[PDB]
Amino acid sequence: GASKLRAVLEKLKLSRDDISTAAGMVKGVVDHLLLRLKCDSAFRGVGLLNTGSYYEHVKISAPNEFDVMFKLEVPRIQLEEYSNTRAYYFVKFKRNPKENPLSQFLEGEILSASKMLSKFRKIIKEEINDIKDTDVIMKRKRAVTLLISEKISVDITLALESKSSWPASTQEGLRIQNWLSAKVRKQLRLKPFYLVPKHAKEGNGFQEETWRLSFSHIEKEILNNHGKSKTCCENKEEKCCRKDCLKLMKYLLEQLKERFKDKKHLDKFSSYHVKTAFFHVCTQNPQDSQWDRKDLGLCFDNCVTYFLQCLRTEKLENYFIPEFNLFSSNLIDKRSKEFLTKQIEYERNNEFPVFDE
């Protein structure tokens, strides 16, 4: 069980130093763009958001690829749920003096996301040309992705920060009461929420004016504070395998994606799908005793088992938005699910050969 798994884990951990050697060139580009971005009136309150695999300590087989996020607060905003999606909204303002920096981006009462990102990419594109230390290139649209020294890639995302209360669609979400207590849940919900630009699927087109809720910052917190016990993983007697199981789940999918990249079945699947399923497993298994380090094998099998159940039943609720099904028949087709299902079941039945691969 754990024998082959922890062996894999040991291998992945060895990619520590290499992920930091390049971060120097990254930290340079990011800091440069932030200065020039603050120059523009609209992107004044722009700032780094310390949420991601970099800060969460969970990055696997993607050392060259980096992911950053730029948050921009929006003091007074009104949100409009789009087509009862429960996860996508419009950005309508409610300020007393209608003179906010985003004025130029408005397309009526609604805030244009397509135009918002246009200026964002526009500034970034113009900024990279300046620096002459390391050759930086902006990748074609297909939101901004940079290529540093032809070896390193950075995915820059723009998020709106609303320190207001979380939308009523999240009310029944984040079921961590029995796991992390109700006191913590109330605390976390007091934290702000973020909005990332993502169009919605429609018959003959997309909706390029919608934003999706983002709670990545909460996810980071929850992962670096995973135990029911406050001293979880702080002593030999209380060491668990929560973080290990997530890392393994992630790596498994990435491998299957890397293996079948040519066909493009798993192209729609993402690490978030795996992270979501994991959080649901944590809720199901609230006790630290259920995540004993000596039970890595058995614990990991549960995750795999649950993830498979989500694929078969085509049901995977957003951990914060219960009515949002990441695995909806419309979002992902049954065939693509049956394929990933088939592959994963094979791996489990053959002591996961995809790991040494």
Binding to ligand 9BV by residue 270, rule CB under 6 A?
A: yes
Binding to ligand 9BV by residue 315, rule CB under 6 A?
A: no
User: Does 156 show up as a binding residue in the annotation?
Assistant: no
Binding to ligand 9BV by residue 272, rule CB under 6 A?
A: yes
Residues numbered 211 to 250 that lie near Zn ion (CB under 5 A) are 227, 232-233, 240
List the beta bridge partners of residue 106: 111
Residue number with CB closer to ligand 9BV (212 or 220): 212
Helix (H/G/I), strand (E/B), else coil: 83: coil
Q: How many CB atoms lie within 10 A of CB 159?
A: 21
Which two structure tokens, joined as six digits, stand for 204? 């003959």
Binding to Zn ion by residue 196, rule CB under 5 A?
A: no
Binding to ligand 9BV by residue 326, rule CB under 6 A?
A: yes
Sign of CA dihedral 302, 308, 314, 319: positive
> Does residue 110 contact residue 94 with C-beta atoms inside 8 Å?
no
Identify each DSSP E strand in the chain by its residue range: 46-48, 65-73, 77-81, 88-93, 136-138, 144-148, 152-162, 193-197, 200-202, 205-207, 211-214
In angstroms, what is the minimal distance from the CB of 166 to ligand 9BV?
13
Which two structure tokens, joined as six digits, stand for 78? 């009104």
DSSP secondary structure letter of residue 24: H
Sign of CA dihedral 242, 245, 249, 255: positive
User: Does 53 show up as a binding residue in the annotation?
Assistant: yes
In angstroms, what is the minimal distance from the CB of 241 to Zn ion?
8
User: What residues contact residue 346 under an 8 Å CB cut-off, 6+ apart?
Assistant: none
Binding to ligand 9BV by residue 210, rule CB under 6 A?
A: no
User: Does 216 show up as a binding residue in the annotation?
Assistant: yes
Q: Which residue is nearest to ligand 9BV (CB)?
A: 272
User: Does 296 show up as a binding residue in the annotation?
Assistant: no
> Does residue 108 contact residue 209 with C-beta atoms inside 8 Å?
no
Residue number with CB closer to Zn ion (160 or 248): 248
CA atoms in the 13 A half-sphere facing the CB of 11: 12
What, of ligand 9BV, Zn ion, none, does residue 52 touch, CB below 5 to 8 Å by kind?
none
What, of Zn ion, ligand 9BV, none, does residue 188 touch, CB below 5 to 8 Å by kind?
none
What, of Zn ion, ligand 9BV, none, does residue 240 touch, CB below 5 to 8 Å by kind?
Zn ion
DSSP secondary structure letter of residue 143: -
User: Does 215 show up as a binding residue in the annotation?
Assistant: yes
Residue number with CB closer to Zn ion (84 or 235): 235
Helix (H/G/I), strand (E/B), else coil: 154: strand
User: Does 3 show up as a binding residue in the annotation?
Assistant: no
User: Does 265 show up as a binding residue in the annotation?
Assistant: no
Binding to ligand 9BV by residue 318, rule CB under 6 A?
A: yes
Q: How many CB atoms lie within 10 A of CB 65?
A: 13
Which uninterrupted H or E stretch holds 82?
A: none
Residues numbered 213 to 232 that lie near ligand 9BV (CB under 6 A) are 214
What, of ligand 9BV, Zn ion, none, does residue 233 touch, CB below 5 to 8 Å by kind?
Zn ion
In angstroms, what is the minimal distance from the CB of 239 to Zn ion?
7
User: Does 346 show up as a binding residue in the annotation?
Assistant: no
> Does residue 303 contact residue 278 with C-beta atoms inside 8 Å?
yes
Residue ranges for the binding site for GTP?
51, 155, 212-219
Residues within the interface to ligand 9BV (CB under 6 A): 212, 214, 270, 272, 318, 326
Residue ranges for the binding site?
51, 53, 65-67, 155, 198, 212-219, 226, 232-233, 240, 250, 271-275
Residues within the interface to Zn ion (CB under 5 A): 227, 232-233, 240
Residue ranges for the binding site for 2',3'-cGAMP?
67, 155, 198, 212
